[PDB]
């Protein structure tokens, strides 16, 4: 039971992972900008295709009766996923970082032609960064006719240190710092922006009340001037987020125009006409919030979904690297260490299933249909 329990666990991961990632690819074709998610799912798809081959080796306990070329290809693909996934996760973080911190200089960069080229570069860097895997992927000379398929370092008693750390540094340490730094500057800008739009909007409401109580053309002229500066200030302030520029910028053409219409009538001395024109702005403010709230709700969904996918990978594999670094100090493993190491990989490959599920669950429209199907199927 326990001897065959471990191969069964990884089979469940392969079955759920293939179905989950296929659904995500199907959903996007039929959040992240529909490019990195597809490429990220391809990394999961390719790795899980090679998963059953390595499961057979586990049952054989060191049997690779599939060919020397297969060992080099499959073992590389297993070690290629860690570099390829985090590079894509780093790419998604930086892509969201540029669109939210330096939108002006990133307009040319954020193109589907450019983004598709970047993915190929990430795959190209992925194969270059796993160079030691290619060099030492030869069949292990296991006693008898069986041949092992692992990493045969020239000095395994001494070369283990650099091989393990170089993977931990490039695949976990470096991207984690970059991604975390990217998403603290993003949230500082987003919090500053969303506290700026409602700060200028609150300037509109306070001055819009002054106009009604105004009794002379001077008060109306000064009240609207504060509104006009706030309107223009909020117009430029829209250029600080990705899903807040193509939607929340066109409206300010009307709002600034209507303030000019009321302001011009104020200069003419038509105080009664100025207040009538100003009263028409209570429908512009009423349409300000109903669009801002929808966008502010939509700009949190994009960030939370992006962070959740990033946070799942760096948490599933976090305990695994705790044991891997620990075993450097404690070379000899104990009875508990064997179970802990097996548990670490089980959570490590759970990333193939949590990422498709977390992306599906966080999509409110997608989960609604599944609930309806359950009700119909329940009968």
């Amino acid at each position, epitope marked *: 039971y326990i001897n065959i329990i471990m191969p069964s666990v990884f089979g469940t991961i392969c079955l759920l992972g293939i179905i989950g990632n296929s659904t995500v690819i199907f959903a996007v074709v039929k959040n992240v900008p529909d490019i990195f998610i597809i490429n990220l799912s391809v990394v999961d798809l390719l790795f899980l295709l090679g998963m059953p081959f390595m499961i057979h080796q586990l049952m054989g306990n060191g049997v690779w009766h599939f060919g020397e070329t297969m060992c080099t290809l499959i073992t590389a693909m297993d070690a290629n996923s860690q570099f390829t996934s985090t590079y894509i996760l780093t790419a998604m973080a930086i892509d969201r970082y540029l669109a939210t911190v330096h939108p002006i200089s990133s307009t040319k960069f954020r193109k589907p032609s450019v983004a598709t080229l970047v993915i190929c570069l990430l795959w190209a860097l992925s194969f270059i960064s796993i160079t030691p895997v290619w060099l030492y992927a030869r069949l292990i000379p296991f006693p008898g006719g069986a041949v092992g398929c692992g990493i045969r370092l020239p000095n395994p008693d001494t070369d283990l240190y650099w091989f393990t750390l170089y993977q931990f540094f490039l695949a976990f340490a470096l991207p984690f710092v970059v991604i975390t730094a990217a998403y603290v500057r993003i949230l500082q800008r987003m919090k500053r922006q969303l506290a700026d739009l409602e700060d200028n909007w609150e300037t509109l409401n306070d001055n819009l009340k002054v106009i009604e109580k105004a009794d002379n053309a001077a008060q109306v002229k000064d009240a609207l001037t504060k509104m006009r500066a706030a309107a223009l200030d909020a117009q430029k302030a829209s250029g600080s987020g990705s899903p807040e520029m193509k*939607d*929340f910028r*066109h*409206g300010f*053409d*009307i709002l*600034v*125009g*209507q303030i*000019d*219409d*009321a*302001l*011009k*009538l104020a200069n*003419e001395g038509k105080v009664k*006409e100025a207040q*009538a*024109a100003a009263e*028409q702005l209570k*429908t*512009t403010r*009423n*349409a*300000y919030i*109903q*669009k*801002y709230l929808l966008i502010r709700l939509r700009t949190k969904r994009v960030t939370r979904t992006a962070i959740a996918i990033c946070l799942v990978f760096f948490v599933c594999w976090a305990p695994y690297y705790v044991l891997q670094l620990t075993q450097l100090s404690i070379s000899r493993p104990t009875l508990t260490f064997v179970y802990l190491y097996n548990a670490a990989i089980s959570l490590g490959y759970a990333n193939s299933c949590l990422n498709p599920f977390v992306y599906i669950v966080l999509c409110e429209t997608f989960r609604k249909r599944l609930v309806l199907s359950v009700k119909i199927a329940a009968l």
Partner: antibody, heavy 122, light 107 residues
Framework: EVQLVESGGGLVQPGGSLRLSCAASGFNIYYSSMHWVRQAPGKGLEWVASISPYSGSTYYADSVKGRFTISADTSKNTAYLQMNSLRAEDTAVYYC???????????????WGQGTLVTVSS | TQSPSSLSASVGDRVTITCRASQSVSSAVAWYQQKPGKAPKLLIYSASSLYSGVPSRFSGSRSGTDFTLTISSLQPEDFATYYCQQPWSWGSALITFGQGTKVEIKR
């Protein structure tokens, strides 16, 4: 009585230029909002452009922004709509309408012209 | 995009023409009547007020996100296409005329 008289429509090849004129009588065009509404043959009303001569603010629809250029001439009491880079779908009947007050275009456009037919076909 | 809807009714009937908005309408819809081959005519402005030259049969209601035009006593000159000016939403055009409801003779 408020009257809006229009002209300038006719035949023009795609990519050509056509300036529509909407002569206004019975009121001063300076303190008003002149709106151009077009209705494609068999289609519903579509808003195109607006201008407030007193303030100078000018609004355009998305489908015509950068291609049309609406303006007004207070001396001649007319409102113009310069059309550039015409397409096949720009074929329609263009009406010029104004609201009762220059700021009440959201409560309805009370007064309308008779309309002019613009035919774009090569 | 969408063809004008058809609303068949006879003389003397009470017709109700409805346009649907994306948000809470607040007295910001105007109804236009266009006979075939003529410029549209304003019927009700401010969604509750009578327009000059418009009989009291026309009246505008407001129920939730739906605003309706009511004709108490349909007349033979009231068979035309009726357009609704949608309340302004941020980012759209200044004025947007919703699809029409063509009122035709029932038989």
């Amino acid at each position: 009585e408020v009257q809006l008289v229009e002209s300038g429509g006719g035949l023009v090849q795609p990519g050509g230029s056509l300036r529509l004129s909407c002569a206004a009588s019975g009121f001063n065009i300076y303190y008003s909002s002149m709106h151009w509404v077009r209705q494609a043959p068999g289609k519903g009303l579509e808003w195109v452009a607006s201008i407030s001569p007193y303030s100078g603010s000018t609004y355009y629809a998305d489908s015509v922004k950068g291609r049309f250029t609406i303006s007004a001439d207070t001396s001649k009491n007319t409102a113009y709509l310069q059309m550039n880079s015409l397409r096949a779908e720009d074929t329609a009947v263009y009406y010029c309408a104004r609201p009762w007050y220059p700021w009440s275009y959201w409560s309805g456009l009370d007064y309308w012209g008779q309309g002019t037919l613009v035919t774009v076909s090569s | 995009t969408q063809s004008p809807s058809s609303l068949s009714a006879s003389v003397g009937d009470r017709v109700t023409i409805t346009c649907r908005a994306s948000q809470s309408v607040s007295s910001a819809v105007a109804w236009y009547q266009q006979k075939p081959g003529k410029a549209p005519k304003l019927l009700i402005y401010s969604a509750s007020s009578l327009y000059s030259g418009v009989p009291s049969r026309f009246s505008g209601s407001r129920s939730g996100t739906d605003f309706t035009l009511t004709i108490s006593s349909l007349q033979p000159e009231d068979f035309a296409t009726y357009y609704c000016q949608q309340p302004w939403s941020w980012g759209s055009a200044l004025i947007t005329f919703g699809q029409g409801t063509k009122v035709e003779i029932k038989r």
